[PDB]
Design a protein around this ligand. Structure first.
Ligand SMILES: [Zn+2]
Length: 46
Protein backbone atom coordinates (compact mmCIF):
# COMPACT_ATOMS: atom_id res chain seq x y z
CA UNK A 1 0.00 0.00 0.00
CA UNK A 2 0.96 3.64 0.49
CA UNK A 3 3.66 3.77 3.17
CA UNK A 4 2.95 7.46 3.60
CA UNK A 5 2.70 10.53 1.37
CA UNK A 6 2.79 9.17 -2.18
CA UNK A 7 0.20 11.16 -4.10
CA UNK A 8 1.35 14.73 -3.52
CA UNK A 9 -0.02 16.19 -6.74
CA UNK A 10 -3.58 14.89 -6.51
CA UNK A 11 -5.14 15.85 -9.84
CA UNK A 12 -8.61 17.45 -9.74
CA UNK A 13 -10.05 15.43 -12.62
CA UNK A 14 -9.72 11.65 -12.38
CA UNK A 15 -11.59 8.93 -14.27
CA UNK A 16 -13.27 6.14 -12.32
CA UNK A 17 -14.08 3.75 -15.16
CA UNK A 18 -10.42 3.02 -15.89
CA UNK A 19 -8.60 5.08 -13.28
CA UNK A 20 -6.76 7.81 -15.17
CA UNK A 21 -5.88 11.39 -14.24
CA UNK A 22 -6.13 14.65 -16.19
CA UNK A 23 -5.56 18.39 -15.83
CA UNK A 24 -8.38 19.96 -17.85
CA UNK A 25 -12.09 19.21 -17.48
CA UNK A 26 -12.77 18.82 -21.20
CA UNK A 27 -9.91 16.32 -21.44
CA UNK A 28 -11.60 14.02 -18.93
CA UNK A 29 -15.20 14.59 -20.03
CA UNK A 30 -13.92 13.84 -23.53
CA UNK A 31 -11.98 10.78 -22.35
CA UNK A 32 -14.62 9.07 -20.22
CA UNK A 33 -16.60 8.76 -23.45
CA UNK A 34 -14.13 6.14 -24.69
CA UNK A 35 -15.89 3.78 -22.28
CA UNK A 36 -19.51 4.73 -22.93
CA UNK A 37 -20.41 5.21 -26.58
CA UNK A 38 -21.23 3.30 -29.76
CA UNK A 39 -18.70 0.62 -30.68
CA UNK A 40 -19.15 -1.82 -33.60
CA UNK A 41 -17.44 -4.82 -32.00
CA UNK A 42 -15.82 -5.39 -28.62
CA UNK A 43 -14.84 -8.20 -26.23
CA UNK A 44 -16.34 -6.28 -23.31
CA UNK A 45 -14.43 -8.79 -21.17
CA UNK A 46 -11.72 -8.50 -18.54
ZN1 LIG B 1 -11.37 6.40 -18.27
Amino acid sequence: GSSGSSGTGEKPYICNECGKSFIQKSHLNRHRRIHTGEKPSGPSSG
